[PDB]
Design a protein around this ligand. Sequence first.
Ligand SMILES: Nc1ncnc2c1ncn2[C@@H]1O[C@H](COP(=O)(O)OP(=O)(O)O)[C@@H](O)[C@H]1O
Ligand SMILES: [Cl-]
Ligand SMILES: [Mg+2]
Ligand SMILES: [Mg+2]
Lengths: 356, 21
Amino acid sequence: MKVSRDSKVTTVVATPGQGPDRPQEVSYTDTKVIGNGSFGVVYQAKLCDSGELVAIKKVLQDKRFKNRELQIMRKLDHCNIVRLRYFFYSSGEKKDEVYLNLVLDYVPETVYRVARHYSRAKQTLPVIYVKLYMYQLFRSLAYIHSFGICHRDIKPQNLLLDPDTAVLKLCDFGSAKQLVRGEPNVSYICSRYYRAPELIFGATDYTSSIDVWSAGCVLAELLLGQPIFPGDSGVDQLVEIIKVLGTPTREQIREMNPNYTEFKFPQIKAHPWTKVFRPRTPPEAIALCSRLLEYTPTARLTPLEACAHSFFDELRDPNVKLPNGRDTPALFNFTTQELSSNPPLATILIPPHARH
Amino acid sequence: ILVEPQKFAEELIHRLEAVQR
Ligand SMILES: Nc1ncnc2c1ncn2[C@@H]1O[C@H](COP(=O)(O)OP(=O)(O)O)[C@@H](O)[C@H]1O
Ligand SMILES: [Cl-]
Ligand SMILES: [Mg+2]
Ligand SMILES: [Mg+2]
């Protein structure tokens, strides 16, 4: 790390995200903090060459151990996942401690901040945006899951938005993990409101379907204007879930965590989805939501199947356009790896006019 | 936190009984 002046200019030798390790000199300026936390700091910066804005995520690093988030992001190359341009190591506020720096594409907005606006304004997020955002989320989920990678922290705050192009990019892979059948995992993963019921039951053999539940929670929140399953504790959140889905059957409990099959829980009647949402809520949104928020993990739709849902039919219309006038972003440029789980969905996912 | 099944189920049962018609 070196200091020049042409305005303060920081120069470092950083390694690119893709390809073999071929570090380049990278210069940037106009650095300012756009995020602090227990994880570390996030800076915005402007690249000297291109003038393009970037986000620099700086976290504490134990050099004796490899960084999981770095190793995961280097594999990822998708239009709905935030791109890792470069990464480098440096020193920070803690003496004799080395920091990992992640240079990512700067994205101005998040799904959270946008939805938060409509809540303050007492309006509802237009269905078109709900479709657009959710579609691109499932698209990114279909991608990472094909690598056997589970995000484990899907929430509106982690869904970056470009308001001008309506492009969504999944970020924050600091909880992501390569899920392998046979090797158990931590159940303390995933953040409040969006945790799958099996996770709340302390299951350690869960799958990537936990992300699909989180996505369902996000979808419901967009239709509702507020989180559907709030609550500080795991019990609190389960009560909310049960107050909507009804008490899970013994078999459903067995699918989540067998250790709870013998306890006699009070039988609570399920609340109809059509009463959970506003009367103006589109039937297909409700239908999609119920196919995501299932007690049994294997019963939940896969991300790819979710993209093919009728709720996203409008996005496959050739004459579709954003409210701001311009065209919708890339939605049909599916790759073979992306369609790896279920190739025949391509007949639906890729409309005839997109093949042109 | 990582709660044992018995303690967790007890709390959950207590809560569900209160929100039951
Ligand atoms: N590439 C980015 N562009 C713009 N903002 C970002 C970017 N990455 C992260 N942020 C912002 O910083 C916050 C936290 O960063 P994040 O990547 O989610 O790591 P973590 O949640 O583990 O702290 C996010 O809420 C997000 O708003
Ligand atoms: Cl009831
Ligand atoms: Mg985050
Ligand atoms: Mg994190």
